[PDB]
Structure formats: C-alpha cells, structure tokens
UniProtKB/Swiss-Prot annotation, chain A:
<dbReference type="GO" id="GO:0003899">
    <property type="term" value="F:DNA-directed RNA polymerase activity"/>
</dbReference>
<keyword id="KW-0808">Transferase</keyword>
<dbReference type="Pfam" id="PF01192">
    <property type="entry name" value="RNA_pol_Rpb6"/>
</dbReference>
<comment type="function">
    <text>Part of the processive rRNA transcription and antitermination complex (rrnTAC). The complex forms an RNA-chaperone ring around the RNA exit tunnel of RNAP. It supports rapid transcription and antitermination of rRNA operons, cotranscriptional rRNA folding, and annealing of distal rRNA regions to allow correct ribosome biogenesis.</text>
</comment>
<dbReference type="GO" id="GO:0044780">
    <property type="term" value="P:bacterial-type flagellum assembly"/>
</dbReference>
Swiss-Prot record, chain B:
<comment type="subunit">
    <text>The RNAP catalytic core consists of 2 alpha, 1 beta, 1 beta' and 1 omega subunit. When a sigma factor is associated with the core the holoenzyme is formed, which can initiate transcription. The rRNA transcription and antitermination complex (rrnTAC) consists of RNAP, NusA, NusB, NusE (rpsJ), NusG, SubB, ribosomal protein S4, DNA and precursor rRNA; S4 is more flexible than other subunits. In pull-down experiments interacts with CedA.</text>
</comment>
<comment type="similarity">
    <text>Belongs to the RNA polymerase beta chain family.</text>
</comment>
<comment type="function">
    <text>DNA-dependent RNA polymerase (RNAP) catalyzes the transcription of DNA into RNA using the four ribonucleoside triphosphates as substrates.</text>
</comment>
<protein>
    <recommendedName>
        <fullName>DNA-directed RNA polymerase subunit beta</fullName>
    </recommendedName>
</protein>
<comment type="subunit">
    <text>(Microbial infection) Interacts (via flap domain) with Escherichia phage lambda antitermination protein Q; this interaction renders bacterial RNAP resistant to transcription pausing and allows it to read through termination signals.</text>
</comment>
From Swiss-Prot, chain D:
<feature type="binding site">
    <location>
        <position position="448"/>
    </location>
    <ligand>
        <name>Mg(2+)</name>
    </ligand>
</feature>
<dbReference type="GO" id="GO:0000345">
    <property type="term" value="C:cytosolic DNA-directed RNA polymerase complex"/>
</dbReference>
<keyword id="KW-0804">Transcription</keyword>
<feature type="binding site">
    <location>
        <position position="71"/>
    </location>
    <ligand>
        <name>Zn(2+) 1</name>
    </ligand>
</feature>
<dbReference type="GO" id="GO:0090605">
    <property type="term" value="P:submerged biofilm formation"/>
</dbReference>
Swiss-Prot record, chain E:
<protein>
    <recommendedName>
        <fullName>DNA-directed RNA polymerase subunit beta</fullName>
    </recommendedName>
</protein>
<comment type="similarity">
    <text>Belongs to the RNA polymerase beta chain family.</text>
</comment>
<comment type="function">
    <text>DNA-dependent RNA polymerase (RNAP) catalyzes the transcription of DNA into RNA using the four ribonucleoside triphosphates as substrates.</text>
</comment>
<comment type="subunit">
    <text>The RNAP catalytic core consists of 2 alpha, 1 beta, 1 beta' and 1 omega subunit. When a sigma factor is associated with the core the holoenzyme is formed, which can initiate transcription. The rRNA transcription and antitermination complex (rrnTAC) consists of RNAP, NusA, NusB, NusE (rpsJ), NusG, SubB, ribosomal protein S4, DNA and precursor rRNA; S4 is more flexible than other subunits. In pull-down experiments interacts with CedA.</text>
</comment>
<comment type="subunit">
    <text>(Microbial infection) Interacts (via flap domain) with Escherichia phage lambda antitermination protein Q; this interaction renders bacterial RNAP resistant to transcription pausing and allows it to read through termination signals.</text>
</comment>
Length: 79, 49, 50, 1335, 99, 50
C-alpha cells in the first residue's frame, strides 16, 4: 500500500511481478480513462493498482480475462 | 567569530550526530551575518552582423 | 609522508590537509628562519655551565 | 532499429568505400573571413552534410519547397544536418601501410613466423625481404642488408624477388596459403608435444583456422583506406572572443593528408628514393599517432606540450566511453543539497524543501496547469511559476502527495546506498532525513550532501514503491542483521529509562497498570528507575496462529513499565527486565520481525525513536571535567615503574645481559605497569556510588556519564576509556619499532611537549593509511562485480545431487563458528538423520528455518552436507535450491535476481574498515583421534607416527568441542578411548624435537655409515653419549654424497627388522640434521628414538586472485614410496614409484627444504611433502573441487571474522564458482588436444556425446582455476572485456576470432540502453528468448 | 542546485555538470551496481534513455508529462553509436547484426 | 544559546573543549560582576581593589 508491499507480495509471491501486474494495470486510468474498483482515496494510480491487487481481486490471470473479452466485443461488432 | 552561551545536553534528537542547535535570538542579534560581495559583468563586442 | 623526529622546531606536525595531500603540504613553525644557504634552522638557548 | 547482436570483424578494403561519402583531397578546414567550411577538407558540406538545415553554399533550396534534392550550384545536399554525425570520409593511401593494433599487440609476426623487432627493419626501409624465392640460395623471409643486396643481384639478375617497406610486408602477407600452412601444423602437432613447443602450435592452430571460418583474409592487416570520423564527432566550434577550440582529431588528420599529398607530389617529379623513403616513414609516424599515439614512437604533440588524444585514448582509461560515458552518465530531473536531521519523521518520509521541488517537478507542475484550465498556454504557465503565484503551490501540493522519489549518497557502497523515499514538503533550503536511515547510509551530519532523483515513468514509481522503499529494507543482504539499529542518542535514553536504582522513592509499592505508571512520573510523585510490584497483560501466539492472552503479577521498576505501552502484542516481558543497553535492544527488534512481520516493525522502529529522544533530553547526561575522574594510585605506579626500570637500566651498564633481551623486559614492565593503571580506574568508575537507603551503604552501577555511554555500547570502549582517565598504552614511532616509554599522563593531565610530538606519529600514520587504502579496496570491489557479472538466477530448481559438507570451525581453540549460523537458511543437500539413525525429518530438501537450527541443536549431529551454488550443474544461471534464504526479505529466493552483484557488495563495503610447545586440555571431554598410527614407548606413553592426526575432545553428547594438531612423534601422555578431564598438559613437546623414533624395537649397531664420508664425528665431550652425527647434505664429501646415511637396526641374524605384519624392510635412511644418540651395539625399544633433529586487505586480494605464493610447499600426485635421482645439481630430485602404477614422475625439488616422508617411505595422493604455503592451482588439481571451496570460504574468513564483521558464507561460494568456469581438455572429439574451454560449454558438449546419439566419443577434462583479473577477460563476451581493462589486448584478440555477443550480461544491455534481463525485465527477455525461435 | 532541462554537452549529447554551469547530477557507474542487485529494471533503464542520452526520447518525455501520459518510449543512446562510429574510424568493422 | 551534543566528547577525544567551556564560564561571569559596578554606579574606589 502507501508504506510497504508485503501484504501484496504475500499474494503475488515476487518482488517484480507486483510491479509488472500493476505496470499493466495502472495505465488504464492514466490514458485509459477508466475508474478503479476500490474507494479512490485521492490516490495516484501506482498504488490504486496496488490496492486492487492486495484486496485479493487481482492476480495476473484475472487481468487477462478482462483484456480478452474486450476484444471479442470489437471483433463481431465490426461485422 | 562571536561567542555563544553553550550547554551540553541531548535535545529530543535535534542535535543527533555532532549536530548544532542554535536558538532564535542569535539570529536576530546578527551575530553570524556575512556580507558576500558578488562580481558580475556585462560585455559587448562586435559581430559579423 | 611521515613525521621524522628531525622536524622538531621547524615543521608544524599538525598542519596538513587531510585528503590526498597529507604528506606534502606543510607550514613552517613560529621561530624558524632559513639558513644563508637555504636550510631550515631553529634558535636555541646556549648552556654555559649550569 | 530493433537489433539483436553485435558483430566485430576486420574491415575489407572495399567495405569502407561502401561506408563513406567520397574522398578528402585537401588539408583545409574553414574559410578564415567567412566562417564557413571549405571544399574537400575535414569539414566540407558536400561530403558530410549541411551546416544549416535546408540551406546550401549558394542558397538555392530553402524552407522545404524542395525537400530532398541536391543543390547543384555548390554540390551540397538539402537534408538534415544531424547527418553530420553519420557521414564518414575516406582517403586513398599512396602506399599501403600497416595497422598498429595488429602489429604492436602480436598477430602479424606470430602469423608469419617472424619477430616483431625483425619486422620493423623491413618496414622502416632498412632491409629487404624475400617475396618469392624461386631460387633457394636465400630462403624466404630474410633480412638482407644493402651491402649483400648487390652481391646476390648480380648472381640472379631478375630471377629473384626482394623488396623492402610496408608494401613488401603486404606482399609477404599476400604470398602464403591459409589452408595449406594449416595442413602442416595440424599434421606435425602430434610429433613431440613438448611444453616449450606446445603453444606455438596451440596458438597457431587457433589463429590459422580462425581466418578460414570467420571469413577473413591475410591481406587486411594493412591499410589502404583511412576512414574519417564525422565532423560533429570532432567539432571545431567558435568560442567567444575570436578564439576557437578543436578536438585532437582535427590536427592529427592534417598530418596524414599532407603526407598523402607530398608523397603524391614526389612520384611524378622523378624523385630520388632516399627522399621517397623518408617521406614514407613520416606517414608511418602520422598513421600511428592518429590511431594510438603513445604506443610506438616519440609523442607528436600540439603547442601545449601534452600528448595528443588518440582514438585509443578515447577508449582507454577513466576518460574512455566504456566507463565515463556509457556506464555512468549525467542525469536530468535531479538535484542535491546538504542533508540535516529530521527527528519528527516517519520511516517512509523524507524532508524536501519547497524552494527546491519547483525545478525538479516543473513539467509535472506544467501538467496540471493546462489540464486544470488555470493556464491557457504553456508560456502562460511558464511565467506563472516564475512569478511564484498563488495556485502554483497547491497544484504542486497535489502532485507530490503519493509520488515517490530517490535519495542517493555517494559513495553508495552497498545496495542500501540508494533508497526510495516519499517527500513531505518543508519550507527551507536543506534536506531533513530520518534518524534510522543514517546507519544505512554511513552519514555523519558534518557537511555531506545527497542526490535526489525523480522516478518519471509509471514503472519507475511502481519500482520505487515496491522494490527499494525505505520500509521495504530493514534487514541486511549480507547477513540476518537489521540495519535499523539505534545508534547513540536513544541508546543512552533507553538505558536511562530502564534502570534499577535502589533509593529514589516508592520502593516496592503496588501499581495497577503502565498507564498509571505514567500517571506517576509525570506527576513527580514517583521516579523512573525504582522497583515496584505491578500487573501486565501480555499475549502469545502459542495458539493455532491465534492471539492467546493471560495476566499475572510482576516485579519491575516504574520506567520499565512505561516502555511496555509500546510493544505490539506478541512478546513476553523477558526482553525488558534489564537495563537495556545496545545488545539488549538488537534482540528486541530482531524478534518482532521473526514474530510479527514488516509493517509492525515499521511502526515499532518509529515509536522507540519517539521516546528515547524525548527522555534522554529530559534526563540530560552532561559531561563535566569532574565526571572525568583520575585514578588515585596512578602516580604510585609510575614511581614503581621508574623503580622497576631502575634496575634494568643500570644492569646493562654492567653488561649482565644484552639490549636484545633488555628491550622486551622494558616492553614487559611499562605494559604491566599500565595494566595496573588501566585496572585501577575500573574500581571507582563502575561502582563509585556507594549509596545509602535505609541501610548502611549499598553499591551498584554508577551514574557517571562517560561510564553510562560505555555501559550502553554507545560511545567509547575499554581501551578508549583509558585515554580520558589514564596512560594510553604505548605509541609507536612510524618505523615499526616502538619506544620504551609510554605517555604516562592522559589528556586530562596534559601531555608533555615532547610526547605530543610522539603522539603525532600515529596521527598521520592512521590518516595516511585510512585515506590511502580506501582506493586499494575500491579496485577490489570492481573485479568482484566483474567475475560475478553474467550470473543471474534463472530457474526455480533443477534438483541435482548432494554438495558440500558443513562441520563447525571451532578449530585451534574456542568454539569459533557454530554450525547454527552456517546452516541457517541453507537447503539441506540430502536426507539428514539424528544420532538415532534412520530418524529423518527431510525428504532430501527443505528450508532450514529458525526451528531446524534448534532441532540440530538438541540432537548432537554436528556435520551437515548442504547444497551450495557451485554444486549446481545448470549453466548460465543457477537453481535456487542451492542458494538459500533471500536475506533481504526472509523467504526462499525467487526466480530472476542477480546474486553476484549482491555478493560483490557484501565484500567491498566491509573492505573500507579492515586494514588495521606443550598443549593442554581445557575442559572435561573425551579423546578421539583420526588417521592414526602410533606406538607404546618404553615409559608407557604415546608418540604419534602420523602426519595427519589431531586431538579431539568429545563431550558427553557426540559432537566435536575442541581440536589441536600434533607433529611426528611428539611426547604425548595419553592415548585413545579415554575421557580425561581438562587442565592437564598432555601433548608436551619442545620447539626442537623432530625425532627419528622407530616403531619397532630391535638392536642398534653401526652399519653402512662411516665417518669422514657422510659424517663429521662430533663426540660430545661433556657426556660421551653422542654418535656419528648426520649433518645436512651441504657440508659433507662429494665422494660420499652419492649415497645417504642408512642405519640398519638388526635382529640376531643381522637383517633389518621389518614392520610387524608386513614383509617389507623398515630401516632408517637418515635425513639431515640428525644427531644420533647412542653408538654401536645398543638397543632402542618400541617408540624410542635413533637420532634427533633440532631446528589484511592484500591477503584478501591474493585469494580471489589465486596469487601463487613465493615459497610453495610441494604436494604429491599418487600413492607409493619414493626413489631419488640426481644429488645436488642446482635443485635435487624426487621420483614417484607407486605400489602398482607406473613410475615416470621426477621433479626438480630442493633438498634445501625439509621433508615429511622419508626416502624408503610411502606417501599418498594429495598429501604434503614439505612445509609452507601452497598454490590453490594444485589444491584444485591434486585434491578435488570440494576442498578448494572449503579452503577459500575458510582461509579468507580469518580476515573478516577477525574484526568480527559478519558475512554469510553463501557469498564466498557464489564468486569462487565463477573462478572455475573453464577446463583443460585432454581427449578429443570436438575440440583441440589441450586447449581451453568453459566447462559449462563442454557440459553441453557431453550432454549429447553420451546421450543416445553417440555412445562416447567425448573428451576428458580437468578444471582450471583463474583469478579475478583473468576470469573476466577469459569470457566469451568481448564487450565486457572492452568494458573493463586492457582493450588494446582485447579488441584485436576479439576481431580475427569473429567474436559475437549475445546480450546476456548486466553490462551487455546497459551499453545499448536496453532493459536488464533480471527481475522486472526478465520475463520480457525470455519472450525474446523464444520470439526468435518463434519467428 | 536543481535542473529540469539545462543545456546539453556538445559531443556526447548528454547533460553538463556543476551548479554554476547549470549542469546536472552524475549518476555514475558505481551507482548502477546497487540497482542491479535490487533487480529494478525500468529505473535503471530510464536513467539512461529518456533522462541522459536519447535525443528523441526526452522530447517525447516532455510531451508525455505535459499531456499527462506517464510513458517512456526509449531508443538508442546517442553516445553508443558514437562508440560504434569511432571503432569504424579505426578501420575495424564493428557493426550491428540486426534480426 | 547553543545546545550541542555531549555524546561526541569521549570517543572523539576532543576534551579540552570541556576545559575551554569551564574557563569560558569564568571570564564572562567576571564580565557580569564588573557590570554590576557599572549599572549600579557605586564608585571606582572599590573597583581599583577588585
């Protein structure tokens, strides 16, 4: 969170993928125009993403499902 | 320099590792006031224009 | 870069910059002058029998 | 633009004309009036490009009406002017001249079988050479003087070939054949592989083959084209007052064009050759200084007398691009200012000034003046922040909230020298830091300043949040220690807080809670340190991960109770029943990490800092001059000392003893006088308060301030309390020898005038070493990074077999290295078992956490095989299950990190500190012995006849407890199978006993050993009972030096009595210096003697360098007895004659060194033959690879453990593994006969030749052992070797060998600026490991 | 002393140094070795491309933060190809093997 | 006025500053006993003795 990253690497298990699951995650509010799922708490998005992980709703896999289903709502939408 | 009424004791971690703690009076008496004199210059030469 | 005991009364043994110029830069002591040749001397009080 | 590897090879003569953009035909630079370039010089716009964008010399094509056509009216293109960085020039040379990096390095004499000195005389136009001798009167490649040049010319006319010059050496390189001359050396390599004639093939079979495979030609060592650096990379720019400024490549190009012009003007004018020769040697000077200036000739200079900077000087040294420009750079978005104390802080917080962050965070501030709509344009926003306007702060104030930042102190000597921070903006001009990050930084608040850095991109904030934040690091990467240990102010105030003074008020009264304890002291109705009877409510996690609590009545003091209102719900009272010094604290915060975790201890660190500061100031421990007391009997020791040196000085006047013994007795007395002074003050300092409280007088620890710092471990020590109280030992004059008289006054009594001069000796000597060998340890750390470069852990686990075996290092004396702190965090190699056998916990591998060090504590097994990263077998990376615990975190280590660039910081960062008989049993233990051959003597005692037995005292448990060594046949008192109490002197031996004890009783007569030949008879006059004394070999007769003395102890019939149980004769061929005791006819019993033989930091460096020491003791090769050869021919011989193996070994050893096994005596493979040090090159070869690791992890350990500076022993293991990444191949199948190759490469080679494709056509190998300024240059990556040292050696030896890179090392992506393939950027890179294989 | 953008040095196209020169701090070679041991990658990447040497990269990075988009599109350091052309001006063909 | 750190005297071995403190306490104190006899303005008769 604001001070440490222990309680999120208890979930992720690595000191670099917690950066990498949030390097992927924390662009969607800078230029992606989206909103988080937790209470915002006036936070900069490099910890808003860290909040979403350490609230147990995000690992690397569950990010990969919302990025798949976005593409199959543009694929037949053209046709 | 000037001379300072000094007193050896720790102060709440303000004088931690050979640090100095001055009081607000010895500022206002202007005891450590130094006049530093800068020296700047303006030069004008010719050109090709 | 040492302190020879022949520096007594001529060379200050507590004056050098403490960086990499510790053994070269030196001062002269108080009462010292230089010889007519150019060597380092020191005045003394001569003893005549007690 | 996306590019993968980097190739170097020689450039063809034709390739450079495919590089360049035309010719330079003139020496001009620019026009002197109109400061515009000239034509066909080193600046021309036609060749290299425009000077202004889209404008030519006339000015036809401007402002992008015509984009990409050429202006005809001058010849100048219309494009960008950044192309002036790119476009190269090329000159034809009049005669082809030689390249210097393939001459002076050697690559052209070695290629032609000629000396480098015997080439130059052919180059310098002194001596002809045979080009093609069709007539064999002169063999090819012959140095023919001008005198004999006329002699053979008349004999042969034009039927011979002989030229002179550097185009004749092109003709020499032109003639021969690569594959044909490779055929012959490959044929006759197997004639006689001599050691003085191996490498002249073994180099040449490499280099002659490398020309064929890498596609290179023998003609390209000469230059016919000189490529020109583009002019922006050698810019002659205008300074201010008409003066200009140039690089060193402008003028060095001018001296080549004019010599390529004057030689042009000589040939047409039919010049004499003596002019044409001297023109040619000036070009040979002019080419060489352009490439490498100070290599060959007298240094061509400018007018300011310094050597001109060559191109190689732009590569070499601290001012080359590989160190000053591509590894360390300047960086924008960064600042620095002086640091100061910020006491009030929290741990993740740094104190940043307001007047600073306006310029670091300026484009961040501009980001929310346009998005907020408070600035319509950027120039509207630019003159608002410069007006310091109202909203400017509160837009910045939103941004720096939750925005990380870096703080870095040079020298950032370990991984914690650069830590992330989060700012909390103050108004001021300096930087306030947290008090528990000073110890992490080596910061004294005396004027140092730190650099701040801005994490720009999104990952850079994420990496600063997650990887390097000051709360993410609490512990050491070197060992288990926390680096948050409180230093000096609080550790007094904690010790003042928790104390036990017997007298204050309220002794033993009742209390109900630590809250109301602070009702008491804050009211003045009690004190801090005064014992009471209380109640606490503690907790425990001794449930199933659940808080279980209880509550009792206690006994403590009041100040100890108030501290218990801090601790977070996990500890007993048993940490704070004390005075709380320093080591009383360092177990508290270590335990709350090992119970609770990080985010508890982040608060717990910030919370003791909030009370130890507020209390020590409240108490106040000033230091008056009467707090410094003087020992009372201090003078009366000095008068006794001048009484004890009184009889010593007057005795040498009589001459009863020399000055050579008088000195150490004076060294004895003044020490032992001071050893009464230095004890005397320690009565009336630690208990000088004898207080009275409803009693007579009661004594305790005193309240003097200089003691309380020493009793807390805050400042000072035992030897430092001296010089403020008593005489300060002895102080040495800087020669090495020490004066006889101490400095009998401390500083409180004032030194004498003369003694302060003697005191100034240690002042410079300490400071002219601690400020000199800082450089001598910095260069150590750099090579520690280099050999540990390309290692990155890149697996989870391969899971190979068992590895190295741990046993505690209790050796010599006391219990020096407990196994608990050697197996800690390690992976168990195999299944381990109790003293109860078949009682196994571990299925061959587990994590040894904090309970298993206590499991092996109980069970007396004390020898553990563990997995170490040298015993892994995976290449280009290791398995994690040979490494152990991630010391920076406290779990098993992950997949992707670099541990070598961890381990290189674990050594150099302590490196800046560490520059400056009879034997007794000590305790009740048993006696055990190993590798034993001994014999009962006539007395009933023991004498040991084995070089390899040690005295071990096992207790009632079954683990080792002590260890002592024993020489051959010392006078022992005990045997084996015993359990004898300590305090007796058992292994009792003289410094002169080297006995000639026999094992077998017999009868001693004189036989084969006469006087006059091999002996001088020294009959002992005082007692008679000496014999014919065997002296050394260097004092006898040469007619009797053909043999040695050999005493035959006989039976009745006259034979040498054998060893009982073997049919072999054991009589003594006597070695030197042996005084035989008794004469002919006598006996000796079993075990009784025939004769008697009377007698820092660069040490850290040499082990990792493998510096072969100056007096190497020799070591054996195979089992078997010894024969001898030539006697006294410079150095002697020793002939290896095994039990059954063949016996060809004979070595030039000396008899001038003493021996261990006798001549008719057997020895084993891997043992010693002499006395002294050793090179580890043997100790890898003769003894296996699992000893040289146990050597270096223990031999270097006696430096760092000496000052007690702890480093966990996985860090020596990782970087000795890199010193063994080679082999010496013996058989064939893939390689040369006896070349060198990485064993990690040849294990890919034996991965298939024994796998089912082939049965076995493979090759057999030993292991190589390099240093650290060798194992880095003996690596496949040529860029790293150019990145580190000796590039002129490197870039020639890498060029003809076609050496590519692969972008694997942690330098190999920095120089291209790529992402590191470690950690965050590893999984990206393994995609690139497959995206080539998938595409 | 602080710096966002000051004037860059002439040849190697990197920033200057010294306060009175309006230069920048020097992130040296010894300051790299801690970051490799951290395993941090992007911070050790973007202290060389967008901060230090890439001419195009710092331009986009200016436009990255003006519009808000925290993003780093690196490229080639404009002193690495300097070292390439300098060996090319020593007549030894070092080059780039692309894909 | 200035509250320095007394935990830099023993282990750093600059000790005469404690003695520079004590003789520095005397000389300003006598500057105040003299300034007694300059504001109270008694005489110069007792001054010449003092």
């Amino acid at each position: 969170a604001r001070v440490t990253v222990q309680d999120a690497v208890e979930k992720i298990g690595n000191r670099f993928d917690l950066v990498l699951v949030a390097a992927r995650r924390a662009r969607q509010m800078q230029v992606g125009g989206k909103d988080p799922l937790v209470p915002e708490e006036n936070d900069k998005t490099t910890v808003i993403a860290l909040r979403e992980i350490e609230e147990g709703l995000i690992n690397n896999q569950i990010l990969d499902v919302r990025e798949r289903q976005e593409q199959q709502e543009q694929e037949a939408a053209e046709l | 320099g000037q001379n300072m009424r000094v007193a050896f004791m720790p102060w709440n971690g303000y004088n931690f590792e050979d640090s100095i703690l001055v009081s607000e009076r010895v500022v206002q008496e202007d005891r450590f006031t130094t006049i530093h004199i800068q020296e700047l210059a303006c030069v004008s030469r010719d050109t090709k224009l | 870069r040492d302190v020879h005991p022949t520096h007594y009364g001529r060379v200050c043994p507590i004056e050098t910059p403490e960086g990499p110029n510790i053994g070269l830069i030196n001062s002269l002591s108080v009462y010292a002058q230089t010889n007519e040749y150019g060597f380092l001397e020191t005045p003394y009080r001569k003893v005549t029998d007690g | 633009e996306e590019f993968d590897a980097i190739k170097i090879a020689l450039a063809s003569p034709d390739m450079i004309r495919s590089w360049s953009f035309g010719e330079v035909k003139k020496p001009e630079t620019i026009n002197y009036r109109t400061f515009k370039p000239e034509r066909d010089g080193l600046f021309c716009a036609r060749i290299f490009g425009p000077v202004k964008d889209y404008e030519c010399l006339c000015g036809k094509y401007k402002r992008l009406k015509h984009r990409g056509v050429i202006c005809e009216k001058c010849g100048v293109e219309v494009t960008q002017t950044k192309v002036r960085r790119e476009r190269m020039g090329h000159i034809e040379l009049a005669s082809p001249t030689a390249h210097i990096w393939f001459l002076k390095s050697s690559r052209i004499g070695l290629l032609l079988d000629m000396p480098l000195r015997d080439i130059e005389r052919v180059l310098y136009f002194e001596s002809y050479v045979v080009i093609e001798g069709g007539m064999t009167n002169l063999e090819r490649q012959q140095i023919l003087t001008e005198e004999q040049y006329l002699d053979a010319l008349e004999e042969f006319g034009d039927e011979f070939d002989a030229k002179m010059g550097a185009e004749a050496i092109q003709a020499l390189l032109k003639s021969m054949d690569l594959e044909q001359e490779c055929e012959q050396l490959r044929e006759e390599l197997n004639e006689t592989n001599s050691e003085t004639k191996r490498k002249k093939l073994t180099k040449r079979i490499k280099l002659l083959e490398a020309f064929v495979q890498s596609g290179n030609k023998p003609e390209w060592m000469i230059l016919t084209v000189l490529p020109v650096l583009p002019p922006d990379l050698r810019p002659l720019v205008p300074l201010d007052g008409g003066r200009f400024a140039t690089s060193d490549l402008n003028d060095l190009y001018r001296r080549v064009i004019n010599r390529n012009n004057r030689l042009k003007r000589l040939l047409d004018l039919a010049a004499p050759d003596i002019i044409v020769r001297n023109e040619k040697r000036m070009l040979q000077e002019a080419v060489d200084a352009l490439l490498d200036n100070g290599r060959r000739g007298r240094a061509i200079t400018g007018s300011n007398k310094r050597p001109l900077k060559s191109l190689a000087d732009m590569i070499k040294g601290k001012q080359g691009r590989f160190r000053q420009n591509l590894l360390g750079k300047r960086v924008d978005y960064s600042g620095r200012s002086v640091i100061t104390v910020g006491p009030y802080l929290r741990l993740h917080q740094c104190g940043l000034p307001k007047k600073m962050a306006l310029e670091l965070f300026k484009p961040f501030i501009y980001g929310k003046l346009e998005l907020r709509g408070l600035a319509t344009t950027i120039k509207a926003a630019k003159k608002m922040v410069e007006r310091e306007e109202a909203v400017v702060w509160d837009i910045l104030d939103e941004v720096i909230r939750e925005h990380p930042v870096l703080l870095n102190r040079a020298p950032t000597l370990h991984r914690l020298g650069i830590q992330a921070f989060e700012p909390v903006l103050i108004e001021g001009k300096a930087i306030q830091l947290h008090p528990l990050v000073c110890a992490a930084y080596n910061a004294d608040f005396d004027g140092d300043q730190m650099a701040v850095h801005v994490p720009l991109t999104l990952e850079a904030q994420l990496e600063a949040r997650a990887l390097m934040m000051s709360t993410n690091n609490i512990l050491s990467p070197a060992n288990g220690e926390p680096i948050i240990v409180p230093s000096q102010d609080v550790v007094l105030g904690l010790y003042y807080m928790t104390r036990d003074c017997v007298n204050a008020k309220g002794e033993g009264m009742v209390l109900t809670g630590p809250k109301e304890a602070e009702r008491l002291y804050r009211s003045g109705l009690a004190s801090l340190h005064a014992r009471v009877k209380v109640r606490i409510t503690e907790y425990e996690k001794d449930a199933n991960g659940e808080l279980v609590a209880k509550t009792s009545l206690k006994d403590t003091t009041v100040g100890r109770a108030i501290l218990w209102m801090i601790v977070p719900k996990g500890l007993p009272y048993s940490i704070v029943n004390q005075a709380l010094g320093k080591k009383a604290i360092s177990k508290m915060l270590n335990t709350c990490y090992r119970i609770l975790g990080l985010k508890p201890t982040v608060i717990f660190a910030d919370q003791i800092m909030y009370t130890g500061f507020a209390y020590a100031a409240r108490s106040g421990a000033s230091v008056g001059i009467d707090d410094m007391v003087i020992p009372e009997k201090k003078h009366e020791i000095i008068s006794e000392a001048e009484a004890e040196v009184a009889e010593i000085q007057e005795q040498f006047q009589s001459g009863l003893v020399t000055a050579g013994e008088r000195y150490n007795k004076v060294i004895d007395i003044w020490a032992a006088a001071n050893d009464r002074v230095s004890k005397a003050m320690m009565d009336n300092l630690q208990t000088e308060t004898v207080i009275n409280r409803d009693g007579q007088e009661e004594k305790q620890v005193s309240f003097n301030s200089i003691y309380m710092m020493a009793d807390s471990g805050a400042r000072g020590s035992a030897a430092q309390i001296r010089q403020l109280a008593g005489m300060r030992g002895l102080m040495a004059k800087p020669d090495g020898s020490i004066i006889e008289t101490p400095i009998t006054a401390n500083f409180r009594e004032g030194l004498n005038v003369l003694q302060y001069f003697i005191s100034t000796h240690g002042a410079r000597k300490g400071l002219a070493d601690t400020a000199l060998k800082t450089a001598n340890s910095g260069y150590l750390t750099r090579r520690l990074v280099d050999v540990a470069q390309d290692l990155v852990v890149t697996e989870d686990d391969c899971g190979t077999h068992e590895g190295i075996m741990m046993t505690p290092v209790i050796e010599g004396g006391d219990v020096k290295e407990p196994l608990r702190d050697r197996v800690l965090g390690r992976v168990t190699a195999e299944d381990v078992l109790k003293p109860g056998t078949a009682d196994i916990l571990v299925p061959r591998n587990t994590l040894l956490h904090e309970q298993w060090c206590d499991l092996l504590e109980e069970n007396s097994v004390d020898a553990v095989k563990v997995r170490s990263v040298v015993s892994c077998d995976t290449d280009f990376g290791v398995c994690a299950h040979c490494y152990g615990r991630d010391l920076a975190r406290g779990h098993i280590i992950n997949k992707g990190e670099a541990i070598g660039v961890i381990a290189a910081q674990s050594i150099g960062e302590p490196g800046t500190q560490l520059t400056m008989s009879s034997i007794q049993v000590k305790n009740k233990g048993s006696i055990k012995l190993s590798n034993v051959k001994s014999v009962v003597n006539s007395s009933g005692k023991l004498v040991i006849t084995s070089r390899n037995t040690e005295l071990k005292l096992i207790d009632e448990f079954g683990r080792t407890k002590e260890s002592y060594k024993v020489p051959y046949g010392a006078v022992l008192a005990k045997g084996d199978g015993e359990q004898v109490a300590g305090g007796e002197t058992v292994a009792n031996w003289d410094p002169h006993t080297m006995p000639v004890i026999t094992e077998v009783s017999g009868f001693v007569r004189f036989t084969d050993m006469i006087d006059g030949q091999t002996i001088t008879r020294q009959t002992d006059e005082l007692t008679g009972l000496s014999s014919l004394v065997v002296l050394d070999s260097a004092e006898r007769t040469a007619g009797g030096k053909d043999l040695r003395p050999a005493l035959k102890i006989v039976d009745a019939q006259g034979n040498d009595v054998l060893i009982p149980g073997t049919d072999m004769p054991a009589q003594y061929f006597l070695p030197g210096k042996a005084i035989v005791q008794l004469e002919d006819g006598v006996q000796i019993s079993s075990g009784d003697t025939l004769a008697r033989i009377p007698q820092g930091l660069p040490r850290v460096a040499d082990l990792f360098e493998a510096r072969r020491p100056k007096e190497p003791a020799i070591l054996a090769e195979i089992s078997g007895i010894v024969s001898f050869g030539k006697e006294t021919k410079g150095k002697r011989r020793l002939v290896i004659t095994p039990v059954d193996g063949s016996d060809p070994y004979e070595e030039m050893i000396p008899k001038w060194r003493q021996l261990n096994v006798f001549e008719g005596e057997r020895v084993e493979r891997g043992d010693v033959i002499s006395d002294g040090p050793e090179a580890p090159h043997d100790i890898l070869r003769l003894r296996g690879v699992h000893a040289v690791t146990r050597y270096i992890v223990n031999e270097v350990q006696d430096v760092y453990r000496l000052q007690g500076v702890k480093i966990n022993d996985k860090h020596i293991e990782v970087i000795v593994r890199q010193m063994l990444r080679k082999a010496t191949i013996v058989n064939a199948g893939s390689s040369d006969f006896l070349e060198g190759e990485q064993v990690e490469y040849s294990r890919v080679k034996i991965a298939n030749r024994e796998l089912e494709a082939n049965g076995k056509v493979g090759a057999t190998y030993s292991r190589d052992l390099l240093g650290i300024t060798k194992a880095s240059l003996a690596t496949e990556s040529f860029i790293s070797a150019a990145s580190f040292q000796e590039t002129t050696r490197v870039l020639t030896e890498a060029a003809v060998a076609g050496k590519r890179d692969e972008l694997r090392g942690l330098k190999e992506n920095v120089i291209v600026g790529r992402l590191i393939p470690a950690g965050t950027g590893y999984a990206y890179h393994q995609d690139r490991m497959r995206r080539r294989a998938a595409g | 002393h602080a710096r966002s953008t000051g004037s860059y040095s002439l040849v190697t196209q990197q920033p200057l140094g010294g306060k009175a020169q309006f230069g920048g701090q020097r992130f040296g070679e010894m300051e790299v070795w801690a970051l490799e041991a951290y395993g941090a990658a992007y911070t050790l990447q973007e202290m060389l491309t967008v901060k230090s040497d890439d001419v195009n990269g710092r331009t986009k990075m200016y436009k990255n933060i003006v519009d808000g988009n925290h993003q780093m599109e690196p490229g080639m350091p404009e002193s690495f190809n300097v070292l390439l052309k300098e060996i090319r001006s020593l007549g030894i063909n070092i080059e780039l093997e692309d894909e | 006025d200035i509250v320095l750190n007394p935990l830099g005297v023993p282990s750093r071995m600059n000790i005469g500053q404690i003695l520079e403190t004590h003789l520095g306490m005397a000389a300003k104190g006598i500057g105040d006993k003299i300034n007694a006899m300059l504001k109270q303005q008694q005489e110069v008769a007792k001054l010449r003795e003092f």
